[PDB]
RNA sequence: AGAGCAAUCA
RNA sequence: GCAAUCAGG
RNA sequence: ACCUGAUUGCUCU
């Protein structure tokens, strides 16, 4: 309903009553006129009487509404609005009855004068028309007479359609003529769009009904005529009437029936009507009928004006509009005139300007059959005014437009031959320009020569000049058995100077380092005799997260033991040592380069410029260095000898990996079916144990963890001594750089006690990094180089125990000879001394690969492994990159050796492939790249190894300044290339259309081809335009409030522009008081320092700044002089990005504003939050410029309160953006994406206005993508990718096998394509050209769409970030005085922003670009099918930047390859796609795109002949590298999702226990320390004596991943909790299986009996240990709600789990980001500074009173604006609500968490866990409701209760189940019993991507909701008084939550929801009126406790079948 | 010495 | 790595 | 002003 409509019907009552009285008079005059000539009864009499009674009905209705609405306009509250709405409804259905009656009156009037008069009928339908025509054909004798046998199968094959005609007639010309029928319709309208719509609807459903129906092998319509005749009279002037009649025969667009002239000409020569106007009609008075018809339209204007169009002929779907810019049109009413130059660019000689305009602005008549009404009127008015604005005479009517455009598509169709000869010409031109490289070695040499030209003298033969070999990390094996290692090293270093300084391969720094270590070991370090113990570190809880060891001087006592001053039992400083010792120590620090002498820094910075600039300091090696190859082979052999020297047998990593792989049969339920493969996994585990893979990576973790924690509050004159769990490893971790800045890091010295047995091999191993070594006793002491790691690199070293052992497992499975030797030999006989040379060499290479992949830390490995990502394109047909990719995109950045092994392995594979289900390796005999590994079993193994070594790498290893400068060099170069190519100037604006976008090469489209292709694509894709618009505005939340959209609500970054105003700078300088130099703090001091620094740098800029922004500039200049001459200020020199780091942001903003004034305005973007900025925009819309507490609460009560729409917010954005503000809205910030690559990609922060506009841009094409079957960006998760590529390859292979039966010739090809620069090289004005062709839109939001893209492209400029901008300005000021493309787009780096023009911002346009890529391939299809010689069929799969295009050819194949200048069909496919895309401004990359005959690579996971190469290695890498870092249970949950996906995508026999181990090590090592140390959970449970055994501890309680692999494959990552809960229910309720358990539970008063038995056992004291498990886990389930941190109101949360997170550590929340957040500013403003960090008690009391008064803002997602913006204010109330904001992300949070785990978080982690478990061991009363809902949740799971019996009773093998054994057991017994117990399939082998079958979130989401309601009620009542157990009769909500928390509130409301099923419709009024607490916190959740669902598991496609 | 190759962190 | 003070050059 | 030594504080403005 609409109150605006209810008011608009009131004031029109006078004219409505006059029109109704005139209607009554005209109807009575018509009745008298008919009755005086026909005294008998007529068919018009009944409808005339119905018209009369409905007319007096609406007369009484409008009288009553006019009487009632007198008080509504004065605002009286006693107006019956619902009664007025009901009367409006009665008015409207009475008017609908009169409209139908008037149509029937027209039909009965015209039906007398027909040449074929139809019989009078009331209800008519095409169905009965067709049945009666068929039986009349069967009965009557005619030429086209049907037979009796032919009668039945027409109706059998017939498909019914739903439409409502007006009449139908069957007519005979003569006795021996043909029987035919004519469909009659009677519609009345002024413009012929009704005629066109009705006639095309009738044509289309008759054609769809009779398309497949054939008579005697002929079409049905050829012999049997069906006629459609539609008659319209125009109700203006002299009442002209016309008939449009046509015969349906074929498709309408290919029929002669398309033209209106042929309709009226076919109406002629048969004389259907004898009538030109109704005054000719016999028996009717002309003036009476004309007055009555105009009289009806003079209420048809009014009723349709007020009530809109609620006609509903076929439910119409009520296409709404977008009103404010609705009246405007894309040309001459937008901000700039651009469509005219678009048209002038589009016009050619063959196709003219007026034709281009007509087609472009009127291609809606082609989709005219299924639009709603008045959309036609809006779009045609827009077309008419667009033609008027473009100075072309518009076509007057839709009929003439249709005849025009039919002739125009006839001339349009002869363009694809021109495009075909164009692409043939371009193919033959590109054939003669490419250069054939002779050999792969010469391609490598050419790439090396080009790299040497780019970087001079980089390659060197001096192998000693390279970087470090075995990373910055060494863990040698050791032989002896915390401080003991340290005194061992002290007794080692007390010996004399027999040290031997080492040459790098074949030295004052070495002497200096050896002296420093011998000083720090002899005269500095002492032992652990002191008993003060370690100091525990707390937080500060002001900025919660900053852990402090406190400045209270009890921590900084520094101690003593003689002369050492140790803290924390390992750190010691120097303060009272000798002066010679201090000089030696400082020379050690100078060689270490910790602490820069500024003299040396300035001297080096001047010297490098003087040395280099008169003629990049990279030192390189070549790819063909056989000396390096021999050195690396020695490196390998020495590493294998070194790794076997460990004798340790117990450890920490050894414990978890031995638990998960020593006996992995406990991960199954059928252990006895596979024996040798479990033995193979045990053999791999034993090889890792004996080779100390687990032990070595344990020292890797201890290394990294102690090295991170080794940066603390110490100064430069101290050092920590670090020890791992090794018996002889030690680091000297000195004073660092960061821990919070991401700088260089912590320098250290490594020392080792490798003995004489491994001394020489160790010297071959670490020769590049050994500085000195000397002999002590029977041992050798080795000292390594000074070494640094960044914090991300230390995290990379911390992920080593998840990285290295799974590398060994997967690589040793994929090594053929190693795997078959492991099957040959036995587990008790596998040893290091028992291989042959080949298998031993395989083991050396595989340990090298495991170590060298788990310890990547340099970008060279990124480079070679990206090269190997695109080095697998060789073995399939036309690759075109076996030489070209190596020549162009291979990066030779080999900065050391140990990557020359990878280069040699790939070069050996390259040379073997050059020497010449798909199995590669038995006949190719190729070589694996990382693990050499000959006799390759399957190409799947090679891609799994290579892609795992790619994806298992860390993310952000890039240096920030270099990465950002390269990532800003990319778009500046790619825009300057266009600007210098098409000849525009830097200073001048875009000049958008220069008409050089007409089929040229670099930046151009074809134009006319594009518009024809887009019209064809919309014709072939957009069906049911009205329904598509309806689901667009429904599903994409367009009419929903803007915060309801996840893309606009989710906490991302937007980077709005935010600078301080120059006026504020002026008065901040003016009110400065020089007498208050010591009183300035914060903002004024910041502005003063910025002005001082800018005066120190550039005086004239401030001179002109104050001249142009102030009148008395001399006062400001002399004030600047007085404030520099004061001497109380702290000036600064050039301190680069640290000047950004250690200062207020206000200083650098005023410094940049006063530095960058060149007659312009400069702005700096600050990265704000998306939700906070949307809150700001809601404030700006609703006119709260400043927040008022009463103004928000005074308006917005309930769902009837004030709201907004996304469209209204969008037009408010354009209203605020069209003003002249310098256009700071379209400013994009470039940031570094963490792309796991050497060549980095980038992420973008576009402003919130741009995000809203671009969300509209993108998501109005989301449903266009959804209706496209050949497109894969509208994907249902990641499953639709593989599924729809599977449909492509399966359908194409079936098509080829069909075409190979009885044909002359047929051929097949495929292309996997990656476009070169999908964003930078693409034209964007094709989007402007293509939005106008949308039939979904109308002019009024389409003009908004064009103006969006136009402003977004013309006024777009990217902005340099401030730190790298000032680095570039530093380079300008002191080194360069010249610059690259950034310094040419910018006027010599005097602006912080540079313009990019049509590089559309990558990743933000994902649906539009993919939709238009699919349109381009449809253009390719209709271009290539214009080949008259041959016939081609294609099926394409499209992603943003990615493509998979297939092709099938038949005909004169060899001749067509001769015309296409290709050796084969894949070659012609590659070249034709390249030329065709190059005509679409789509640059196909010739390197990373290969055309095959059997392989498809769409985005990944190549499928061959319909068999997907599984590629589980991406999940295997995601299981070890990426974790969430939020909690331990959260990390285990997130990694178990990837474990389940890994199992579902297929994994071999030996790698999944290692994957279980890897996710366990990642979660435990990060959060809750893995056993053998403190903060363990198994140790804490054993200490507290809980009855649970070690392998069923719940994961939220700190337990391990204990789920079996079958439920972890079928159920999901909650299967561990469900399995342990099912086990304890089966244990307590003493039964045997799940069916018996649920049968015992299904009878009531049984759980009551067991709970009373448990109560009696607890009373007596006879608590047996089975029941102790029961009390503990139901207390865990029942008190998992509150726990710690339940203040989060997370609805729609992840992890599909049962329990909660229990304990979550507080994230670091600085005050700087809080005070930067504007919503926190508004919070601190509306509630003052007493709540910013006794009156604060009353402040929070008021905030909780208005919590409890409106808890809808905090319970569920916001409804109105009184539920959202004040929710954003309330989001900072109390701690653990502020702990959900962090700009920390993944990389720097793990160091915070490992620092938090062993700290006081005041208690600590183990104290909190101990007190929590001690509280859960109690029997808090009335837990029966919790026990009942827990047992109900376990029992009700249908998928679990179907999986468990068929897993317990699964037959093992045979009978077409498990006839194979090669890794198909986790195919068959994982899914085939489950996927035949759940809806059936015919599959045996496949790959699996499942649904959301286990949607177990129906309990944990109300667990979170009941937690937040319980805890906000707890804050409220604990604030309102202390000692709350039962209240003192407060208000009703307080009494109800008292009832709630007197018992277990969560479990009582779960029981309450278990009986009741009320479920009110959530109107925010009635739900509050029924009852407050229990239904408002149960049924507001949009659901209740209900059942789960099971599906068919979605088996995508069949893998290769073995039987 | 180390991280990187935009002349940058120490 | 920074911040300021106190000295020396 | 610019560099070394002695003090305490920041260890994510």
3-class SS at A1395?
A: strand
What's the CA–C1' distance between A566 and D5, in Å? Answer: 23
**Cα–Cα distance for residue pair A380/A394, rounded to 1 Å:** 10
Q: Give the contacts of A660 (CB within 8 A, at least 6 positions apart).
A: A1553, A1554, A1556, A1557, A1560
**Cα–Cα distance for residue pair A121/A126, rounded to 1 Å:** 13
> CA A1875, A1878, A1883 angle in degrees (round to 5)?
30
Residue nearest to nucleotide B4 (CA to C1'): A959
**Cα–Cα distance for residue pair A1009/A1329, rounded to 1 Å:** 12
- For tokens 């996710």, name the residue: A1559
- Which run of H or of E encompasses A330? none
**Cα–Cα distance for residue pair A510/A502, rounded to 1 Å:** 8
**Cα–Cα distance for residue pair A226/A136, rounded to 1 Å:** 13
Q: Give the contacts of A1592 (CB within 8 A, at least 6 positions apart).
A: A1599, A1602, A1620, A1623, A1624
Assess whether A122 (CB) lies less than 7 A from strand C: no
Q: Which nucleotide is nearest to A454 (CA to C1')?
A: B5
Q: Give the contacts of A180 (CB within 8 A, at least 6 positions apart).
A: A170, A171, A224, A225, A226, A227
**Cα–Cα distance for residue pair A697/A801, rounded to 1 Å:** 5
**Cα–Cα distance for residue pair A1401/A1226, rounded to 1 Å:** 11
> CA A1143, A1144, A1148 angle in degrees (round to 5)?
85
Cα dist from A940 to A917, A945, A948, A2000, whole Å: 9, 9, 12, 12
**CA atoms A1751, A1753, A1756, A1761: torsion sign:** positive
Q: Which nucleotide is nearest to A1127 (CA to C1')?
A: D1
Q: Give the contacts of A1886 (CB within 8 A, at least 6 positions apart).
A: A1867, A1871, A1995, A1996, A1997, A1998, A1999
Reading across the β-sheet that carries A1242-1246, which strands appear in turn? A1242-1246, A1227-1232, A1357-1359, A1393-1395
**CA atoms A509, A514, A519, A524: torsion sign:** positive
Q: Which nucleotide is nearest to A1708 (CA to C1')?
A: D12
Q: Give the contacts of A1427 (CB within 8 A, at least 6 positions apart).
A: A420, A1456
CB–CB of A1764/A1043 below 8 Å?
Answer: yes
Residues 1090-1149 of A, Cβ under 7 A from nucleic strand C: 1130, 1132, 1135, 1138, 1142
3-class SS at A249?
A: coil
**Cα–Cα distance for residue pair A1615/A1621, rounded to 1 Å:** 10
**Cα–Cα distance for residue pair A796/A787, rounded to 1 Å:** 16
- For tokens 């649904």, name the residue: A1891
- Other residues' Cβ atoms within 10 Å of the Cβ of residue A116: 16
Residues 681-740 of A, Cβ under 7 A from nucleic strand C: 715-716, 735, 737
Assess whether A744 (CB) lies less than 7 A from strand D: no
Cα dist from A1634 to A270, A1665, A1877, A1962, whole Å: 80, 21, 16, 38
Strand A1227-1232 with A1357-1359, pairing: parallel
Cα dist from A107 to A55, A101, A126, A167, A272, whole Å: 20, 10, 17, 9, 14
List the beta bridge partners of residue A755. A779
CB–CB of A1123/A1115 below 8 Å?
Answer: no
Cα dist from A1254 to A252, A1131, A1246, A1332, whole Å: 37, 45, 10, 17
Cα dist from A811 to A139, A943, A950, A1690, whole Å: 79, 12, 14, 41
**Cα–Cα distance for residue pair A1649/A664, rounded to 1 Å:** 39
Q: Dihedral angle at the C-alpha atoms of A1721, A1726, A1730, A1731, nearest 10 degrees?
A: -60
Q: Give the contacts of A1912 (CB within 8 A, at least 6 positions apart).
A: A1687, A1744, A1747, A1748, A1751, A1754
Burial classification of residue A1469, based on how many CB atoms lie within 10 Å of its CB (0-12 exposed, 13-18 middle, 19 or more buried): buried
List the beta bridge partners of residue A181. A170, A226
- For tokens 């875009």, name the residue: A990
Nearest to A589 by CA among A485, A718, A455, A682: A718
Nearest to A798 by CA among A1578, A1542, A1563: A1563
Assess whether A596 (CB) lies less than 7 A from strand C: yes
Cα dist from A251 to A136, A247, A368, A370, whole Å: 26, 12, 15, 16
List the beta bridge partners of residue A775. A780
CB–CB of A1856/A664 below 8 Å?
Answer: no
- Kindly give the residue spans of alpha helices, DSSP state H, lying in A1425-1495: 1453-1459, 1465-1478
Q: What is the resolution of this structure in A?
A: 3.7
State CA A1504 to chain mean position distance: 28
Structure tokens at A345: 């660019």
Residues 804-843 of A, Cβ under 7 A from nucleic strand C: none
Strand A718-722 with A730-734, pairing: antiparallel
- Size (chain A), residues: 2003
Residue nearest to nucleotide D6 (CA to C1'): A575
- Which run of H or of E encompasses A589? helix A579-592
> CA A891, A897, A903 angle in degrees (round to 5)?
45
Structure tokens at A1764: 């959202």
Q: Which nucleotide is nearest to A735 (CA to C1')?
A: C1
Structure tokens at A1435: 């099926």
Q: Which nucleotide is nearest to A1792 (CA to C1')?
A: D12
List the beta bridge partners of residue A232. A242
Q: Which nucleotide is nearest to A1143 (CA to C1')?
A: D13
3-class SS at A1979?
A: helix
CB–CB of A1871/A1673 below 8 Å?
Answer: no
CB–CB of A1786/A1642 below 8 Å?
Answer: no
Nucleic acid strand B: bases within 7 A of protein CB: 1-10
**Cα–Cα distance for residue pair A427/A1476, rounded to 1 Å:** 10
List the beta bridge partners of residue A566. A572
CB–CB of A752/A741 below 8 Å?
Answer: no
What's the CA–C1' distance between A1111 and C4, in Å? Answer: 38
Residues 1132-1151 of A, Cβ under 7 A from nucleic strand D: 1133, 1141-1145
* 3-state percent helix, strand, coil for chain A, nearest multiple of 5: 50, 5, 45
**Cα–Cα distance for residue pair A590/A560, rounded to 1 Å:** 27
Nucleic acid strand D: bases within 7 A of protein CB: 1-13
Cα dist from A1223 to A334, A960, A1162, A1357, A1996, whole Å: 16, 29, 11, 10, 49
**Cα–Cα distance for residue pair A1434/A1296, rounded to 1 Å:** 11
Give pairs for A148-154: CB < 8 Å, separation 24+: A150/A215, A154/A213, A154/A215, A154/A220
Nucleic acid strand C: bases within 7 A of protein CB: 1-5
Nearest to A144 by CA among A244, A232, A221: A221
Residues 1703-1722 of A, Cβ under 7 A from nucleic strand D: 1708, 1710, 1712-1713
**Cα–Cα distance for residue pair A1769/A1879, rounded to 1 Å:** 50
Structure tokens at A861: 């490995």
Assess whether A599 (CB) lies less than 7 A from strand C: no
**Cα–Cα distance for residue pair A816/A814, rounded to 1 Å:** 6
Nearest to A681 by CA among A662, A694, A695: A662
- Which run of H or of E encompasses A749? strand A748-752
Q: Beta strands of A472-521 (E only): which ranges? A: 500-501
**CA atoms A503, A508, A513, A516: torsion sign:** positive
Strand A1995-1997 with A1887-1888, pairing: antiparallel
What's the CA–C1' distance between A813 and B6, in Å? Answer: 44
CB environment A875-886: b (16+ within 10 A), e (fewer): bbbbbbbbbbbb
Nearest to A726 by CA among A745, A751, A744: A751
Structure tokens at A1201: 């309160």
3-class SS at A165?
A: coil
Q: Which nucleotide is nearest to A1138 (CA to C1')?
A: C2
Q: Which nucleotide is nearest to A1129 (CA to C1')?
A: C4
Assess whether A602 (CB) lies less than 7 A from strand C: no
Structure tokens at A1318: 């999908």
Q: For residue A1753, which phi and psi values (nearest 5 degrees)?
A: -75, -25
What's the CA–C1' distance between A1423 and C6, in Å? Answer: 85
């Amino acid at each position: 309903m609409n109150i605006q409509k209810i008011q608009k019907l009131i004031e029109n009552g006078t004219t409505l009553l006059l029109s109704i009285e005139d209607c009554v008079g005209s109807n009575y005059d018509l009745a008298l006129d008919l009755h005086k000539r026909n005294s008998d009864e007529i068919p018009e009499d009944v409808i005339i009487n119905n018209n009369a009674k409905n007319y007096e009905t609406m007369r009484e209705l409008i009288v009553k509404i006019t009487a009632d609405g007198e008080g509504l306009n004065k605002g009286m509250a006693t107006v019956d609005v619902k009664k007025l709405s009901e009367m409006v409804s009665l008015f409207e259905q009475k008017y609908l009855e009169t409209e139908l009656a008037r149509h029937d009156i027209f039909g009965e009037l015209i039906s007398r004068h027909l040449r074929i008069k139809p019989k009078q009928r009331s209800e008519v339908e095409i169905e009965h028309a067709l049945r009666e025509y068929l039986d009349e054909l069967n009965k009557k004798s005619c030429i086209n007479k049907l037979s009796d046998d032919e009668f039945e199968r027409i109706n059998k094959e017939y498909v019914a359609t739903n439409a409502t005609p007006d009449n139908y007639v069957i007519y005979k010309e003569s006795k021996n003529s043909e029987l035919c029928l004519i469909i009659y319709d009677w519609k009345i309208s002024v413009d012929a769009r009704t005629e066109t719509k009705t006639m095309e609807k009738y044509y289309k459903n008759i054609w769809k009904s009779f398309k497949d129906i054939k008579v005697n092998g002929k079409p049905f319509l050829e012999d049997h005529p069906v006629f459609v005749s539609i008659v319209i009279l125009k109700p203006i002037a002299g009442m002209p009437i016309t008939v449009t009649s046509s015969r349906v025969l074929e498709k309408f667009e290919d029929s002669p029936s398309a033209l209106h002239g042929e309709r009226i000409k076919h109406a002629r020569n048969a004389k259907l009507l004898n009538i030109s106007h109704v005054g000719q009609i016999v028996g009717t008075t002309p003036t009476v009928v004309r007055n009555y018809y105009a009289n009806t339209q003079k209420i048809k204007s009014e009723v349709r004006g007020i009530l809109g169009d609620d006609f509903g002929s076929k439910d119409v779907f009520f296409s709404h509009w977008t009103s404010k810019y609705k009246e405007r049109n894309p040309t001459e009413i937008a901000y700039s005139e651009d469509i005219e130059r678009i048209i002038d660019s589009l016009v050619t000689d063959e196709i003219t300007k007026e034709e281009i305009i007509h087609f472009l602005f009127g291609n809606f008549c082609f989709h005219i059959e299924t639009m709603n009404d008045q959309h036609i009127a809006d779009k045609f008015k827009g077309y008419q005014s667009s033609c008027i604005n473009l100075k072309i005479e518009p076509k007057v009517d839709l009929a003439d437009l249709k005849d025009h455009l039919i002739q125009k598509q006839q001339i349009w169709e002869s363009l694809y031959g021109k495009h075909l000869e164009k692409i043939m010409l371009r193919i033959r031109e590109k054939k003669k320009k490419e250069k054939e490289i002779p050999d792969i070695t010469t391609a490598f040499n050419q790439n090396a020569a080009e790299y040497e030209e780019k970087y001079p003298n980089c390659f060197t033969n001096d192998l000693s000049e390279t970087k470090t070999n075995f990373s910055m990390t060494w863990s040698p094996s050791f032989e002896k058995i915390n401080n003991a290692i340290i005194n061992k090293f002290r007794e080692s270093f007390k010996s004399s100077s027999r040290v031997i300084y080492n040459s790098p391969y074949s030295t004052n720094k070495a002497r200096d380092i050896t002296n420093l270590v011998r000083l720090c070991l002899t005269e500095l370090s002492c032992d652990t005799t002191k008993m003060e113990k370690q100091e525990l570190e707390d937080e500060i809880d002001i900025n919660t997260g900053s852990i402090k060891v406190e400045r209270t001087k009890k921590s900084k006592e520094w101690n003593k033991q003689g002369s050492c001053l140790t803290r924390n039992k390992n750190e010691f400083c120097m303060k009272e040592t000798g002066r010679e010792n201090k000089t030696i120590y400082f020379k050690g620090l100078a060689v270490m380069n910790i602490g820069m002498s500024s003299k040396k820094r300035i001297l080096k910075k001047e010297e490098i410029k003087e040395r280099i600039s008169k003629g990049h300091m990279k030192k390189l090696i070549r790819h063909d260095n056989e000396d390096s190859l021999s050195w690396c082979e020695r490196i390998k052999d020495s590493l294998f000898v070194l790794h076997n020297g460990d004798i340790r047998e117990e450890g920490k990593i050894t414990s978890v990996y031995n638990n998960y792989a020593k006996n992995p049969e406990c991960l199954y339920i059928q252990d006895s079916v596979l024996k040798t493969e479990l033995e193979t996994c045990k053999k791999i585990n034993k090889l890792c144990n004996d080779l100390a893979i687990y032990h070595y990576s344990e020292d890797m973790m201890q290394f990294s963890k102690g090295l991170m924690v080794a940066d603390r509050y110490m100064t430069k004159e101290s050092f920590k001594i670090l020890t791992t769990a090794n018996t002889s490893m030690m680091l000297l971790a000195f004073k660092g750089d960061g821990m919070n800045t991401g700088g260089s890091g912590v320098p250290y010295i490594a020392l080792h006690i490798v003995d004489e047995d491994m001394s020489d091999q160790f010297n071959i191993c670490y020769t590049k990094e050994i500085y000195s070594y000397f002999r002590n006793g029977s041992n050798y002491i080795y000292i390594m180089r000074p070494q640094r790691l960044n914090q991300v690199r230390l995290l990379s070293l911390f992920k080593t125990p998840s990285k290295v052992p799974v590398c060994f497992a997967q690589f040793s499975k994929k090594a053929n000879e190693m795997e078959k030797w492991l099957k040959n030999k036995d587990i008790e006989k596998v040893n290091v001394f028992s291989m042959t040379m080949t298998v031993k060499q395989i083991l050396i290479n595989i340990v090298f690969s495991s170590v060298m992949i788990g310890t990547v830390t340099k970008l060279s490995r990124m480079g070679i492994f990206d090269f190997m990502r695109y080095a697998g394109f060789l073995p399939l047909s036309d690759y075109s990159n076996i030489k070209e990719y190596i020549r162009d995109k291979f990066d030779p950045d080999i900065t050391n050796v140990a990557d020359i092994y990878f280069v040699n392995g790939i070069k050996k594979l390259l040379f073997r492939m050059e020497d010449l289900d798909i199995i590669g390796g038995i006949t190719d005999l190729n070589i694996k790249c990382p693990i050499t590994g000959s006799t390759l079993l399957t190409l799947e193994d090679l891609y799994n190894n290579v892609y795992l070594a790619i994806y298992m790498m860390p993310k952000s290893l890039h240096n920030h300044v270099h990465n950002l400068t390269s990532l800003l060099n990319v778009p500046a170069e790619w825009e300057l290339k266009f600007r210098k190519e098409l000849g525009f100037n830097i200073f001048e604006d875009i000049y958008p259309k220069k008409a050089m976008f007409d089929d040229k090469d670099l930046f151009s489209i074809n134009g006319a081809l594009n518009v024809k292709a887009l019209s064809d694509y919309y014709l072939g894709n957009i069906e049911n335009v009205g329904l598509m618009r309806s689901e667009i505005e429904n599903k994409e939340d367009f009419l929903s409030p803007c915060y309801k959209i996840s893309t606009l609500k989710s906490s991302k970054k937007c980077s709005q522009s935010n600078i301080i105003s120059t006026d504020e700078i002026i008065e901040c300088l003016q009110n400065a008081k020089i007498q208050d130099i010591e009183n300035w703090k914060g903002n004024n001091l910041a502005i003063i320092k910025g002005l001082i620094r800018t005066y120190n740098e550039e005086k004239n800029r401030l001179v002109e700044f104050f001249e142009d922004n102030c009148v008395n500039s001399l006062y400001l200049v002399e004030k600047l002089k007085e404030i520099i001459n004061s001497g109380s200020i702290t000036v600064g020199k050039s301190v680069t990005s640290k000047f950004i780091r250690n200062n207020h942001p206000l200083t650098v903003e005023t410094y940049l504003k006063t530095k960058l004034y060149y007659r312009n305005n400069v702005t700096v973007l600050k990265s704000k939050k998306v939700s906070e900025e949307l809150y700001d925009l809601v404030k700006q819309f609703h006119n709260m410029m400043e927040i008022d507490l009463d103004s928000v609460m005074n308006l917005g009560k309930g769902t009837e309160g004030k709201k907004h729409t996304f469209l209204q917010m969008l037009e408010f954005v354009m209203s605020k953006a069209k003003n002249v503000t310098g256009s700071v809205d379209f400013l994009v910030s470039v940031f570094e994406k963490m792309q796991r690559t050497k060549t980095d990609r980038e992420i973008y922060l576009m402003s919130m206005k741009v995000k809203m506009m671009l969300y509209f841009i993108e998501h109005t094409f989301k449903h266009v993508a959804q209706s496209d079957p050949s497109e894969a960006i509208s994907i249902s998760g990641d499953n639709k990718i593989r599924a729809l590529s599977t449909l492509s390859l399966d359908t194409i292979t079936s098509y080829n096998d069909i075409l190979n039966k009885n044909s002359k010739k047929s051929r097949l090809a495929f292309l996997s394509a990656d476009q070169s620069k999908w964003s930078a090289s693409d034209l964007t004005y094709k989007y402007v050209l293509a939005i106008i062709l949308n039939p979904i839109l109308t002019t009024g939001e389409a003009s908004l769409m064009i103006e969006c893209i136009l402003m977004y492209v013309k006024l777009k400029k990217v902005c340099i970030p401030t730190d790298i901008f000032l680095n570039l300005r530093k380079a300008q000021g002191t080194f360069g005085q010249n610059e690259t493309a950034i310094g040419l787009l910018t006027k010599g780096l005097t602006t912080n922003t540079y313009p990019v023009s049509m590089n559309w911002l990558q990743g933000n346009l994902n649906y539009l670009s993919s939709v238009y890529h699919s349109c381009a391939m449809k253009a390719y299809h209709k271009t290539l099918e214009c080949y008259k010689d041959c016939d081609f069929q294609t099926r394409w799969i499209v992603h943003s930047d990615d493509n998979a295009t297939s092709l099938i050819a038949s005909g004169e194949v060899d001749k067509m390859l001769t015309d296409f200048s290709s050796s084969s069909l894949p070659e012609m496919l590659f070249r034709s796609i390249e030329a065709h895309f190059k005509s679409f401004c789509i640059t196909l990359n010739p390197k990373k795109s290969y055309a095959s005959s059997s392989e498809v690579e769409f985005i990944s996971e190549r499928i061959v002949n319909g068999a997907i190469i599984p590629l589980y290695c991406r999940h295997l890498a995601n299981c070890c590298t990426e974790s969430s870092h939020i909690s331990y249970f959260d990390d285990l949950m997130s990694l178990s999702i990837h474990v389940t996906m890994l199992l579902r995508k297929g994994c071999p026999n030996e790698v999944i226990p290692f994957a279980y181990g890897a996710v366990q090590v990642q979660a435990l090592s990060i959060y809750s320390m893995l056993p053998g140390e403190v903060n363990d959970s198994i140790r804490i449970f054993k200490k507290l004596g809980v009855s649970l055994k070690s392998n069923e501890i719940p994961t939220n309680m700190g337990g391990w991943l204990t789920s079996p692999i079958e439920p972890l494959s079928i159920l999901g990552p909650s299967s561990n909790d469900q399995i342990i809960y099912y086990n304890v229910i089966r244990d307590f309720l003493n039964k045997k299986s799940l069916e018996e358990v649920k049968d015992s539970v299904s009878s009531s008063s049984y759980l009551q009996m067991r709970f009373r038995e448990l109560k009696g056992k607890y009373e007596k004291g006879t608590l047996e240990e089975k029941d102790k498990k029961m009390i503990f886990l139901i207390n865990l389930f029942e008190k998992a709600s509150v726990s710690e941190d339940s203040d989060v109101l997370t609805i729609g949360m992840k992890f599909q789990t049962m329990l909660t997170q229990i304990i979550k550590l507080p994230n670091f929340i600085n005050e700087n980001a809080l005070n930067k957040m504007s919503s926190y500013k508004d919070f601190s403003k509306l509630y003052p500074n007493l709540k910013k960090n006794i009156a604060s008690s009353l402040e929070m009391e008021s905030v909780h009173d208005i919590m409890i008064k409106n808890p809808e803002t905090i319970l569920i997602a916001p409804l109105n604006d009184r539920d959202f913006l004040l929710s954003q204010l309330f989001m900072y109330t109390s701690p653990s609500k502020r702990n959900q904001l962090s700009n920390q992300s993944t990389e720097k949070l793990a160091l915070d968490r490992v620092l938090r785990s062993k700290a006081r978080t005041k208690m600590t982690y183990e104290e909190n866990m101990e007190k929590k478990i001690l509280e859960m061991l109690k029997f808090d009363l009335d837990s029966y409701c919790s026990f009942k809902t827990c047992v109900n949740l376990v029992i009700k799971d249908v998928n679990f209760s179907m999986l468990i019996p068929i897993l317990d009773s699964a037959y093992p093998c045979e009978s077409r189940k498990r006839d194979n054994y090669n890794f198909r057991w986790f195919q068959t017994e994982k899914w085939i019993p489950v996927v035949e117990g759940s809806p059936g399939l015919v599959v045996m082998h496949a790959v699996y991507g499942s649904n959301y079958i286990e949607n177990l979130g129906l309990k944990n989401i109300p667990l979170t909701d009941d937690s937040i309601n319980v805890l906000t009620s707890t804050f409220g009542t604990g604030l309102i008084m202390e000692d709350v157990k039962s209240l003192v009769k407060g208000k009703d909500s307080f009494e109800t939550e008292a009832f709630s928390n007197s018992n277990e509130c969560q479990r009582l409301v779960k029981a309450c929801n278990y009986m009741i099923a009320a479920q009110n419709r959530l109107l925010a009024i009635n739900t509050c009126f029924t009852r407050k607490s229990f239904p408002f916190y149960s049924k507001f959740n949009l659901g209740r406790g209900f059942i789960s669902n099971t599906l068919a598991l979605l088996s995508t496609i069949y893998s290769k079948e073995e039987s």
